[PDB]
Design a protein around this ligand. Structure first.
Ligand code: MG
Lengths: 49, 181
């Protein structure tokens, strides 16, 4: 009936601003200038395919 | 056949010696036929067997064992039990003689041996018929040889890390297989 308390571990290399570099490149740098237009035209042209 | 002992008194047990002396010199003088004298000018009890009165040769060492067990920290009545019977020994060990502990780790080790409100200590005494005094770090155990090996094995299982609930459970199993014999 002795329960110790959980040591909450400390993460390793998995942080949302370090995930962005784990693939080939720096993925923050290949972005667009208008995400809203990218979204609405991407959806429409998907449906027209 | 005139012979003596002299055993010293550490200062934290010098108040309770001069505070309970009245119950100590009687069952050393008539019942044992033994001639006490407490020196203060070197802080020590001294005993001597006087060749006329005495009969039992083991009286001198019986008294020396009694006073010494009062010295290490055991209360009066328990030391009297050392004076009466013929099957009582004391075993003393440390905390650094099991596992080298220091810092806070050692004060937490004494916290597990003593338990809250003394409970854990008392359990070890009550289910083994021994008496434990737990000094600064040195731990002293009084009983008969098999019983003090039982209580030594529980105390050492408590120093090394095992929680106290496990040692209550294993203690009552030991009590079962002790009381039958
Ligand atoms: Mg945290």
């Amino acid at each position: 009936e002795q329960s110790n308390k959980q040591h909450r571990k400390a993460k390793e290399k998995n942080t949302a601003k370090k995930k962005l570099h784990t693939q080939g490149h720096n993925a923050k740098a290949f972005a667009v200038a208008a995400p809203g237009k990218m979204a609405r035209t991407m959806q429409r042209s998907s449906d027209v395919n | 056949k005139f012979e003596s002992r002299k055993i010293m008194v550490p200062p934290h047990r010098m108040t309770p010696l001069r505070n309970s002396w009245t119950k100590i010199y009687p069952p050393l003088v008539e019942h044992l036929k033994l001639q006490v004298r407490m020196n203060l000018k070197t802080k020590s009890v001294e005993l001597r067997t006087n060749p006329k009165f005495t009969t039992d040769p083991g009286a001198l060492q019986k008294g020396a064992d009694f006073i010494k067990a009062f010295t290490l920290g055991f209360d009066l009545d328990d030391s009297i039990a050392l004076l009466r019977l013929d099957d009582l020994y004391i075993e003393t060990f440390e905390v650094k003689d099991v596992k080298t502990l220091t810092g806070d780790h050692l004060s937490r080790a004494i916290g597990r041996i003593a338990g809250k409100d003394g409970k854990t200590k008392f359990a070890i005494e009550n289910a083994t018929r021994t008496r434990i005094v737990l000094a600064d770090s040195k731990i002293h155990i009084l009983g008969g040889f098999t019983h003090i090996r039982m209580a030594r094995e529980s105390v050492v299982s408590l120093i090394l890390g095992s929680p106290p609930g496990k040692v209550y459970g294993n203690l009552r199993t030991v009590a079962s297989r002790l009381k039958e014999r």
